[PDB]
Symmetry: D2
Subunit: 425 residues, 4 copies
């Protein structure tokens, strides 16, 4: 239909140049797709009430951040329990249940060179309480990431380490840090004090670009909607900053004081949600996909090979979604690195992977709870049908849509190799 091609900035998406793409942006072209940039909300006095956390989950919060710079272990354990109670209050309806990751933001090394003793204790607290992510403060070199990894012990092997770049050394040693990290956070607060304030945008745009190239998650953080701590609406610079972080290529956007201590935690989440949807439709996918494809090296890994085939197939038919079965989240992450316009619906039995895939843009995790079928092929199909039924319920899919389905040839992680074109019935 003609109405379909007027929505989600589709006239601007078919432009032959970036300049004509900008000229074709339409304030009346309403976003159609689900919001793909994850929202991280920092927990605190303003957002710990189980009833308030349910409202923030409904507003769009995907990751709950625990700032270990404030509060005791007892306070953070209560935070975790309240988060989990609000999240599990929706588990009764599996087709609409939203997983929410728990991220521990460390205090940092302070005037020291290595892992502080408080960080060692907080990291072990995280492992004991099953946190999904660590936002490691003031990472300056690859050895800092190794020390965080060592402090998590043998039972914290699955925890994702997102390195916070907050100073000149972190920016200069970026490549070595990214190589050993699961992802990066552009921690603009400290970075804006450590380097000239007028240079932060260069560091942000560089790090987002390099993470997009590496296929690793990147978070844009601090003062995104700062004025919303006290005011019900943000400034023009604030909405622009959120939209530009999304247009830059950020996988996640973050709220600090806006959700931890402010008077508008639910409204700050709703504002980030509304801006991110508008900004994602305004992404010039033609140039982005082409540049991601050209820059990505050749690969002999069947997961990586299937992912680019599926993203290409998804673009060819305007697929509403790419449904992928995943154990660790990796197959969904490899689909995500090519920035498809189609939503990546990731079906998994791992509650931890379902939480952690929120770090990857455009990945919508679905927690599958059923015990395995006796016939593996039937078990794979029930999970694909679960993705279709959830997608229909959530508005991602309709009858007649085309979907790309990504599976593997055998059980277990690391064997994704099949891409199938499916029509929604």
């Amino acid at each position: 239909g003609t109405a379909f091609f007027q929505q989600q900035q589709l006239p601007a998406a078919m432009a032959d140049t970036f300049l004509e793409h900008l000229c074709l942006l339409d304030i009346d072209s309403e976003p159609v797709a689900a919001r793909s940039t994850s929202i991280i909300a920092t927990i605190g006095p303003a957002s710990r009430s189980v009833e308030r956390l349910k409202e923030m989950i409904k507003a769009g919060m995907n990751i709950a951040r625990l700032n270990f710079s404030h509060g005791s272990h007892e306070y953070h354990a209560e935070s975790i329990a309240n988060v989990r109670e609000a999240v599990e209050s929706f588990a009764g309806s599996p087709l609409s249940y939203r997983p929410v990751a728990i991220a521990l933001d460390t205090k940092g090394p302070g005037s020291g060179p290595g892992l502080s003793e408080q960080d060692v204790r907080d990291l072990r607290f995280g492992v004991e309480h099953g946190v999904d992510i660590v936002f490691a403060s003031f990472v300056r070199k690859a050895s800092d990431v190794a020390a965080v990894r060592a402090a998590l012990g043998p039972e914290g092997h699955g925890i994702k380490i997102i390195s916070k770049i907050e100073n000149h050394e972190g920016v200069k040693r970026f490549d070595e840090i990214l190589e050993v990290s699961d992802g990066i956070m552009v921690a603009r607060g400290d970075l804006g004090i450590e380097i000239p304030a007028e240079k932060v945008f260069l560091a942000q745009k560089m790090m987002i670009g390099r993470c997009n190239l590496a296929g690793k998650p990147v978070v844009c953080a601090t003062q995104m909607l700062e004025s919303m701590i006290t005011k019900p609406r943000p400034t023009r610079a604030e909405t622009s900053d959120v939209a530009n972080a999304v247009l830059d290529g950020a996988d996640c956007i973050m709220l600090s004081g806006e959700t931890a201590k402010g008077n508008f935690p639910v409204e700050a989440v709703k504002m980030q949600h509304a801006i991110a949807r508008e900004a994602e439709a305004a992404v010039y996918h033609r140039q982005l996909f082409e540049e991601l494809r050209r820059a990505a090296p050749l690969s002999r890994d069947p997961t990586e090979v299937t992912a680019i085939g599926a993203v290409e197939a998804a673009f060819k038919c305007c697929a509403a979604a790419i449904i992928v079965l995943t154990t660790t989240g990796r197959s969904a992450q490899l689909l995500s690195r090519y920035r498809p316009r189609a939503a990546v619906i990731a079906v998994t039995r791992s509650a931890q992977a379902a939480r952690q895939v929120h770090l990857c843009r455009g990945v919508f995790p679905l927690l599958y709870r059923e015990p395995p079928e006796a016939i593996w092929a039937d078990d794979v199909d029930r999970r694909v049908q679960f993705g279709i039924e959830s997608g229909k319920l959530r508005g991602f899919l309709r009858v007649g849509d085309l979907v790309i389905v990504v599976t593997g040839w055998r059980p277990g992680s690391g064997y994704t190799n099949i891409m199938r074109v499916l029509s929604i019935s």
Copy 2:
């Protein structure tokens, strides 16, 4: 890894260039072609190439399609030539490393409508089971419809390749291509009907439009003309063959060179050698991107699977794309995106195996095994047949990655699956 030697062969340094100009500068005469020759060779069978023994040598040299020119000879003469082609083709039906399907194409004499002789010759083609018709002097869409009507109740599966030989056919090209299975740039008559210095424009335009439409295009006439009397061609002749391949031609043709000349086998060998060199020199980076950008969005799962499979093949430098096809359509749709990987088409149809030679880079395998009771097993047996033939022919080695294209249920029109397999 694949090794430094791997990335110096088949013009791979020139393939990674960021501009077409840089790509030309990086072409290396020492960079040897490794992939199998993907542009099919059509050889005209006449007095100089009719014998069963000569035909076996032409098949070994690379002939994929045998052309019978109905402007010369009689029905009896061409029936004997067809029988000799089939005898030479079936002489290799043992050793699978030598058995190659060979299509039979009937080139009509030409025309106020369809000529009485054309109606009789087209009827002869149906009775003798020809695979293709090269229809002479097609000027408009109604000319194709007349040839289509003459292919009668039994020959609707025969491919009609319209020969564009005059100003009217060039001007009415879009309407002709829409109703034809493919096109032949018949340069001989075209060079007399329009100024000789304009033929290259017509050739480049028609090849481009056929590539865009995803339909086969043949470059024909005087490609190696001097080889009718001389054992080696001129510098202009080898250049013409290489440039037809670089232009985007699916097939290249030999007329008098193989029908009446003194070096028919040498002419086939020469076209084979040039085509291999020219295919490695194709700038796939720009070609694939432009084919992709110009091709409209599709909701046909075969077309969607094909672009996914070609993208996947480039990503891992796949040795081949193995496709299961009954009519040849799934292989044709893979072929339109010009993959560097060979498209191994496994089929139970002898006709589809011969006809897919019209599509660049499609290597047909005719499968004769009895069907398995379980369809999923029958599919795996043909996929393994393609891998084993590929290993035997030199396309594949253990540890290689291949892309496998199949459908979700039996029958034609359901291709929707692309799998990345590691060769064991």
Copy 3:
């Protein structure tokens, strides 16, 4: 590597590490972002003009001199506040601070005066207060009018009519502040001299989360049209009370420049805030960093591809001069202009080289601040007897001022743009000159 090797041996590796030059030679926009370096220092003069609102915090002659030194190019007078007497006093103070540096072209900095109208309130047509304020502007010789709440082409015709016969030279920058203005944008831009993305009212008239789409669309269309575009409101809002801005604020300023804005504006930051000079200095520092981070390779190619073929010799000379400037990394393009038009046409192709515009018109010297990368040099000398010698004196004046201000260095290449006959509209010559 080979398309920079000889110039790298000549100019040195240090030259090619500054002003984001490694990021500028990238083959993709993605590679360009990856190559951005916080240690790559900006070298070029700041090309995006700063508009500062003059009010209670920035009215004094002494404060205004500090603001001019900090980088203020255009003084905005908001006719929504104050009286005619109040704004006349502000204009006189701006002119006194500006003329305190008139002693030498090396210290002179021309500053435009812009009148921002109150608007039509609930009225469809021009308000009676606007008619009086517009006549005040003509009587006080303002250079620009920022016309509030423009909704259609007839609104700009009404503003033009209210300026009378003596306000023909005044530039009209239409403020787009509502849904109707955005929808009728093309018809408004066609009759306006430029546009202002008035985000404050626009953010109330349309959903706040859609303002960035309107800003990016309008900046793109103005860049395509070759007309000035201003990004305005809340750019450094927190600097009204704090000495440093938020991370969102510096990002917003950098992104307005990266979007293609010719001017950036400060409102309460300079009108009523505690850090007016610091707000101007902050916009100057961010704009210099953001201009070096512009991906000129894609920008110039896209401006070329989108611009139609032209038979106007000024337009033809401008693209030839911008192409020549990029080829040799020219330090500047010196252009002779009467109305500012030849400098504007150079400016639409976004050269990295500074456009030094030599003019005798004091008004054109002030108004060219609306065009990104145009540095106005007012020529005060009496005309020579021979026209060709007058032109050469003006060109040498640009070179000597450029050397003294640091734009030009010995060994640099400059591109010189002149005409064949006197008078406006005859630019047709481009010359490559080596600085000795």
Copy 4:
């Protein structure tokens, strides 16, 4: 529209090919120079006048055949036919004389030393040096031309594997290259010659140096009045590849249709030049060309950019050595490069550069240098109007210098005709 303008505005090379129209007639003058070998079939003064009218720009004398006396007679006949049109200076066409050496066979041969000395004594403009295989071979040819031999342009013939492999070092010291396909097709596999041709043409286009495509281009025309389909295709593809010159050997030296072979190359080259995809070509030439601090190089790119912006009918350039015209030519403008020169040798040698139309200025010098320049520019305009290049209302780009003498080009002006 004419001259493949619908195909020229295409956004992709594929769509450009699809838009090629056999009814879109070429309008611009033929840019690719034709080199014709002068021999028994083309030696007469009367035959040479018809070859000049057919389009011959450079006369090649093959020193593998004939004697010094024979070639001197051929040179005299070429000069007599060329000067028969000098009465009308606005339409006179200069013709270069090129000496093709015999070669080294089994250093520089003693016969080559004598033939090169003959060339200097007879004022040849170009040397096509046979079997160049390294930079030292070019230096030997340069030495054999003596102190009174720097004026002659050395075009190195690449005819074997070593020449192809050491191409970059040969191109660096040569004025240009000839893809000598005859010997190259015997020295390397015949099916690889197209790779060597396309690589060498690309590298010469990148270097901004002339490249000639030679041998068997219209071979069948030695005995037949019309060429084969492969032959016309080969000529068109050499032009589409980026060749500055195309050559006729036996077709003009010993064949039954020498004038027809020249006419055929002229007709094909005009069609192929209009089918060049300038959008991609200019962008790639610009991107690949290095940054430069030379004002001639800087003015050249500015002028070519300005010409495309207004669809300029021509770029009129004043040149002493031909260098300013060569630097304009390397950017492949669609606009004709009309090179107004006082040097007769420069007017002949500039035929090696695609799209350069040489004009010999034979009017008296004006008193004011500034006045003298304007008359050389008006000369270009009057010749252009007479030859069909220009019409009243057209836009031209004029490339002049700031001071007399070679090496000072730095000015580009946009001028409206009449």
